[PDB]
Structure formats: structure tokens, C-alpha cells
Curated annotation (Swiss-Prot), chain A:
HAMAP family: Ribosomal_uS2_B
Biological process, per Gene Ontology: cytoplasmic translation; ribosomal small subunit assembly
UniProt cross-references to InterPro entries, sorted A to Z: Ribosomal_uS2, Ribosomal_uS2_bac/mit/plastid, Ribosomal_uS2_CS, Ribosomal_uS2_flav_dom_sf
Modification N6-succinyllysine, positions: 107
The name this protein goes by in its record: Small ribosomal subunit protein uS2
GO molecular function: structural constituent of ribosome; zinc ion binding
GO cellular component: cytoplasm; cytosolic small ribosomal subunit
Function description: Required for ribosomal protein bS1 (rpsA) to bind to the 30S subunit.
Pfam entry (one): Ribosomal_S2
Family listed: Belongs to the universal ribosomal protein uS2 family.
Keywords: Ribonucleoprotein, Ribosomal protein
Organism: Escherichia coli (strain K12)
Gene3D superfamilies hit by this protein: Glucose-6-phosphate isomerase like protein, domain 1, Helix hairpin bin
Swiss-Prot record, chain C:
Family note: Belongs to the universal ribosomal protein uS15 family.
Protein name, entry field: Small ribosomal subunit protein uS15
Keywords, sorted A to Z: Ribonucleoprotein, Ribosomal protein, RNA-binding, rRNA-binding, Translation regulation
InterPro entries, A to Z: Ribosomal_uS15 (IPR000589), Ribosomal_uS15_bac-type (IPR005290), uS15_NS1_RNA-bd_sf (IPR009068)
SMART domains: Ribosomal_S15
Gene name of this polypeptide: rpsO
Organism: Escherichia coli (strain K12)
GO terms for MF: rRNA binding; small ribosomal subunit rRNA binding; structural constituent of ribosome
Length: 218, 129, 88
RNA sequence: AAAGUUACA
RNA sequence: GGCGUAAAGCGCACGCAGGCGGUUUGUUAAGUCAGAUGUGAAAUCCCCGGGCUCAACCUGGGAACUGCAUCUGAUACUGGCAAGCUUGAGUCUCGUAGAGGGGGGUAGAAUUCCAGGUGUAGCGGUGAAAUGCGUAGAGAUCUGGAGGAAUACCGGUGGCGAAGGCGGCCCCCUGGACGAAGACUGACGCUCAGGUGCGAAAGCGUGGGGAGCAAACAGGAUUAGAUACCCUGGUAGUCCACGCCGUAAACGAUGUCGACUUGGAGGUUGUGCCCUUGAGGCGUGGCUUCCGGAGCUAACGCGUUAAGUCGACCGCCUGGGG
């Protein structure tokens, strides 16, 4: 209900014209996001998020820009859910029959860090295996515990995470994305018009969303 | 210059639905009011209004049942370059009767189904499918 | 180019009111004044083809107004072409 | 600077 | 069904016949529409039946004969007529920016030539050379003069013009765009076969003029040859007056005129408002450039200046070659 007032955004002087209903202009060559038309749909997204969290749908959080790179970890690993904080691999959803192999290798390497590849072999091979494990971990991170495809996708930038959105639309996964004035509503299933390149705002979005999910676990 | 104001009317509707506009507006006319009356009662477009004293201005509230537009295809038939008049025998059917044809009879502007029941013919103004 | 003083004289003459500029009598008479005036210019500058194009626009658009006024009321057209002196 | 050509299944 | 690139938008415009035409009221019923009557030969076709044992075939009734004429009535649309209304189109007032056009002058730079003064043995040219020019004294340099042609910088996907096209400065004749606010006319409009006009360069004719370039031509090279590219020259032409020609990859390969349909960045040229404060800002118009959304499409791409959605006319295409 327009509480924080730190999510006005505008991303730029210019815009994407499909964002017209949610904005008005400002003196700084700036597109003020209509929060009065953001809070109603935000609750709607929270309402459906509460509904799918009751069904235990393995909600996935996606954020790669440095603002939300670490916060997505804080919100996903907070309660019960998964995340993608580094680069979204092209096709980690549509081509999940292949990405599941990399998770299997990551688990095997994670096991090998406890019984195998730590001292049973040379440093010239133990180092590169360990280097590969952390390379695999940062990319295939929170989704390592996901058993398959998710049921709902949460996105911080529609424009930045366009590939992930297109993959979810290709599948049957609702996309709960927050959109700036430069983003594209065409493709997401629950728009949340607001600022996205700011810590003060994304933490508010994630904190509200995670709290809704934790209620949904009941 | 403008030589078919009705074909202009259908273009505003067609482009307004393609542009997802909440309303289209054009200079008003007796014929436009008569046709827009047909389109409103038939369901294709919502309420329409005529404002003005010396320059009447006709506004149509476009209708969208879903993300799609209610008016799928709207076409001009009897144009000034080619007038199409139909007997009561051969009044056209648009989309197997799912759509309508707006026809001008001697008893006002009606649909193909209305003119058929009235047993009249006339000018085929447009197909609204 | 039909100096402002010259235009006022013709507007006041053929116009049915002191400020009636726009009636087809005035429009035709203004065109006639310039068509006649431009005639001397082109007796010297034969190869001024660009100015002659503008002259032909006035010649044709006067015929449009003359042909229009005759249709509306042939009587007022007859007193116009006689007083101006044209249509031969 | 000079530098042409070379039949198909 | 097509016409940017596959065949296909006249080079551009004005414009008669023709085609089409804003809005309101009335009126007439011509188109149009609803019945009715007369007729639309029979046979054929079709539908329901009947007879040859079935079939073909034959045959009873219909229905058709999509047409035309006449009578009655309906007036929504189109047409005629009458009266209007301003939106389209146009007239006037004021101003603005322009290589728009025609004519007449003139300024400076440079090339060439001519006459002179210094003055020396090379200059010029090429990939290299040579022809060529030069001890009759060139080239270089200075002075004077004559002639013609073109206007560096500005200068800019800048501007103007229907197109072709238009570039120093000044004058006098002239055309067209645009804008602000006002009046005025009241459909005066759009397109246009035939017709008429304009229409790069080259070319042609008659007079001039001729600096520089330069087809042809000549000489030198290069080459296997070299009727070429390169070099040295050089005539028509290029320049002017007046006629003719009437064609260009005359091209954004995109006819003209209207309407409607997300955006971004600029250029150019008007303008009306505040805090005229000071650089500025907010808006509104006209042309113009680039990128791009939907949509379009064979794809390239086009994309508010459409190749999108549509209307009104016109032109043109129908396999390649011949
Ligand atoms: Mg074809
Ligand atoms: Mg070709
Ligand atoms: Mg053309
Ligand atoms: Mg005509
Ligand atoms: Mg221009
Ligand atoms: Mg010439
Ligand atoms: Mg000659
Ligand atoms: Mg030569
Ligand atoms: Mg040609
Ligand atoms: Mg050209
Ligand atoms: Mg052509
Ligand atoms: Mg095409």
C-alpha cells in the first residue's frame, strides 16, 4: 500500500511504450512508475504465490544483476526455495534433460570433495577438479535441490532475464516478474511494475515475497 | 480526398482494435450513427456517443472479450467504386451466420438476418465477422 | 505580386462587403489582375518556365472558379466575365 | 609494371 | 493475381471527356428494394412419379428459364432538384526561411597566352621511360596586359524546386512553400485516357566565343598484339543567343490524393507562454535524416515520409530468347 516509497525507478529517460499504463513523467527526464497501480497487482501476485506455495510448487527465484545477485540467495535459501544468482544458462529449463546431468556431476564432485578428490590424487588434478566444482556451483546453485521443473518463476528484470522468461513461456510455468519502464510486459504472467536496479527496492520485493511463501508452507 | 466515409469508419475500428485502443473516434454522420447502432446491439462494439453542435463527433467504445479483439475481421463491400446490391434471395452470410452483414434496406440499416426476416434486400454496406 | 494597395482596390470593388475577400468574384478578379499583369513579364522573359508554371496554376484555378460560378447561378457569372473582360 | 586461356559425366 | 529488388509506377506536371465525392433538411423516385401481372416456345437440364423384365430410352406433373416490360409502394443508400452548413478546397491581412526561375552587372583567386626584367641548364612526365618543351635561351621568379570559364572557405543525409535541376556578391522582374491570429467564399474537391507543357548529358542547325578540359586524331610507351588503360599533345564539344531533339540506373528501381495505426534520437524553419530573470523550459506547426515496435513479405527489408490498415482514380505486367 505504497509504504516503502523506494521503488519508483524509471530506469532511464526513455521507455518501452507497452509500459504506458503504469507511468507518468518527471522533471529529470524520468518516468515515474504508478505505485497506486502497482500495489493491487503485487497483492495478486502474492495471492497466487501463496496458492502455489500451498501446493509445494518449487518456486524459483531469478536475479543476476549485482543488485539482486546476493539478495536472491538471501530470499530463496531463507525458507525452502531455489535460485539462480549467476548467469542463466541458455536452456536450463527447456533443455532440463541435459542440465540435470550437470547437477548429477556437481553432486558427484560434491561427494568427491568429502571422500574422493581431496587427497587421493595429484594437486595438478585436485586443483582443477576443485576449480571446476566452484565453477559449477556458482552457476548451478540453488537449483541443485530442485527435483525437476519448477511450477512458478520469479524474475527481477524482464529485460535482463528475458531468456529465462521465454523458456518459462515455452514451458507451462507462470512468470512473476517485476518490470521497470524499459522492460516488456509481453511474456510475463504477473506484472509487478517498479524499480529493479536498487538494493532498497529488490530487498523489499524479495522480503515480501519470501514472507508470503513461508506462510504458504503452512 | 475522402470519398468513402464509411470505409473510413471501419478502418478506425479495425485499426483501433489492432492498436488495442479503449475507444475510437471519427467525425460523426447519420450513416455512421445508423451503422454504429447496428454494431452496438449486435455485440461487436460497446456503447457509442455523439458529441458536438456544428461538428458532430462520433465515439465508439471498443470491446475486448479477452486479450483478443471482439471485431475479428471487418470489411467494406459496397464501395463508391463498386456498389453491391443484393436481392432478398441472395443476401450474404458471413462466417456461416456466426458473423453479420450490415445491409441498408428501405426500412433502415439492419443486419442480414434482420433483413431476411423482413423479406427485404438492399445495399451490402459491410461484413462484420 | 498584386501589391497590398492594388488588392484592396479589387477586394472593395468586386466584394459584396468592405472586408469580403473570398467571394468568387473577388477571387477571379484578383487572378485576372495578376494574369494580365504577368503577361507583360513573360513577353520579355520567355524562358522563365518556373514563373510560368505558377501563372498556369492561376489560369487553371480561375477557370475552376469561373466554371463553378456559372453552375451555381449563370446570371452572376455573365455580369462578371463582361465587367472583367474575358472568356474569348 | 606485365598476369591470356584451359569441351564434361 | 500482381507492379522496391522476380515481368510490371509513364521522367515530371497541368488538364478536357470519363470515374469518384464532406455534412444537414426537404422533395422526386431514376438506380435499389418488396409484391403483382404479361412474357421468357416445346424439347433439354434438376425433383417427385409412371412404362419398356432393369438400364439406356420414353413419358405425367412440377421447379427452373437467373431475363425483359408494365402496374403498386419503401425511402435507408446512390442519383436528380431546392435550401443550406462548415470540417475539405480556396481568398485576404502580417511576417519567415530559402543554390526556385528570368535578365543585367561586378569581385577576387587560379589556369592559359602575350610583352618585358633577372637568371641559368634543365623542365615536364612515369611504376620506369619516352614522345614533348629548352642554349634561338626554357623551367623558376617579378612586372604589365588580354581573354574565357568556374565560383575555394562558408558547406551541412543543410535548403529550394513538380521533375529535370539550382552554389560568389549586388540590383530589377517573378513563382511557390510555411507559420500566428483573424475575417471571407461555401463542395468551389480528388484522379485523369486522349491533349498540352516542362524535361540531365550527349547530339543537331544558324550566328558568336574559346582560357581550362577534352571524344576523334597524332606521337610515345606497355603488350605476344594494344585500334585500350598510362604519357605528351589535341579538334568537335563543353560557354553564349535562338531554335530542334525528347532520351537516362530521368531511381527513394516505390503514381497521385485523403484518412487511421506504439516509440527513440537528431537536423532545418515558423510560433505562444510563463521567472523575459542568465545560459534556459514547457508546448504547438511545416519539411527532413537515422534506428526501430506491431503489422506486412519469398526473404532481404519497409516500418507515422509504410513496402501496415483502408478508400478514389490512373498507368503498367502475364515464361526466357527472338
Ligand atoms: Mg502473379
Ligand atoms: Mg533485373
Ligand atoms: Mg517516378
Ligand atoms: Mg476532367
Ligand atoms: Mg522541398
Ligand atoms: Mg547540352
Ligand atoms: Mg552547337
Ligand atoms: Mg588524353
Ligand atoms: Mg524510359
Ligand atoms: Mg537524377
Ligand atoms: Mg522506371
Ligand atoms: Mg511487396
Amino acid at each position: 500500500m505504497l509504504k516503502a516509497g523506494v521503488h519508483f525507478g524509471h530506469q532511464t529517460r526513455y521507455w518501452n511504450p507497452k509500459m504506458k499504463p503504469f507511468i507518468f513523467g518527471a522533471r529529470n527526464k524520468v518516468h515515474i512508475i504508478n505505485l497506486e497501480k502497482t500495489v493491487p497487482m503485487f497483492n495478486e501476485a502474492l495471492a497466487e504465490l501463496n496458492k502455489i506455495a500451498s501446493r509445494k510448487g518449487k518456486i524459483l527465484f531469478v536475479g543476476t544483476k549485482r543488485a539482486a545477485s546476493e539478495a536472491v540467495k538471501d530470499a530463496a535459501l531463507s525458507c525452502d526455495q531455489f535460485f539462480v544468482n549467476h548467469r542463466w544458462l541458455g536452456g536450463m529449463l527447456t533443455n532440463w534433460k541435459t542440465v540435470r546431468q550437470s547437477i548429477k556431476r556437481l553432486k558427484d564432485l560434491e561427494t568427491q570433495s568429502q571422500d574422493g578428490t581431496f587427497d587421493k590424487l595429484t594437486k595438478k588434478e585436485a586443483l582443477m577438479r576443485t576449480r571446476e566444482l566452484e565453477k559449477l556451483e556458482n552457476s548451478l546453485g540453488g537449483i541443485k535441490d530442485m527435483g525437476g521443473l519448477p511450477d512458478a518463476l520469479f524474475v527481477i528484470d524482464a529485460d535482463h532475464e528475458h531468456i529465462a522468461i521465454k523458456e518459462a513461456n515455452n514451458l507451462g510455468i507462470p512468470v512473476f516478474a517485476i518490470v521497470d519502464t524499459n522492460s516488456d510486459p509481453d511474456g510475463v504472467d504477473f506484472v509487478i511494475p517498479g524499480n529493479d536496479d536498487a538494493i532498497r527496492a529488490v530487498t523489499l520485493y524479495l522480503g515480501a515475497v519470501a514472507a508470503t511463501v513461508r506462510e504458504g508452507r503452512s | 480526398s475522402m470519398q468513402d466515409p464509411i470505409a473510413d469508419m471501419l478502418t478506425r475500428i479495425r485499426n483501433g482494435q489492432a492498436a488495442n485502443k479503449a475507444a475510437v473516434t471519427m467525425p460523426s454522420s447519420k450513416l455512421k450513427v445508423a451503422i454504429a447502432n447496428v454494431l452496438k446491439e449486435e455485440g461487436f462494439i460497446e456503447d457509442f456517443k455523439v458529441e458536438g453542435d456544428t461538428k458532430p463527433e462520433l465515439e465508439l467504445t471498443l470491446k475486448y472479450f479477452q486479450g483478443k479483439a471482439v471485431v475479428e475481421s471487418i470489411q467494406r463491400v459496397s464501395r463508391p467504386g463498386l456498389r453491391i446490391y443484393k436481392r432478398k434471395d441472395e443476401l450474404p452470410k458471413v462466417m456461416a451466420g456466426l458473423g453479420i452483414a450490415v445491409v441498408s434496406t428501405s426500412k433502415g440499416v439492419m443486419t442480414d438476418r434482420a433483413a431476411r426476416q423482413a423479406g427485404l434486400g438492399g445495399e451490402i454496406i459491410c461484413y462484420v465477422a | 505580386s498584386l501589391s497590398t494597395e492594388a488588392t484592396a482596390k479589387i477586394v472593395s470593388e468586386f466584394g459584396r462587403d468592405a472586408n469580403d475577400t473570398g467571394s468568387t468574384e473577388v477571387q477571379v478578379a484578383l487572378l485576372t489582375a495578376q494574369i494580365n499583369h504577368l503577361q507583360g513579364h513573360f513577353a520579355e522573359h520567355k524562358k522563365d518556365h518556373h514563373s510560368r508554371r505558377g501563372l498556369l496554376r492561376m489560369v487553371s484555378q480561375r477557370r475552376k472558379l469561373l466554371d463553378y460560378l456559372k453552375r451555381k447561378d449563370v446570371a452572376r457569372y455573365t455580369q462578371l466575365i463582361e465587367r472583367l473582360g474575358l472568356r474569348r
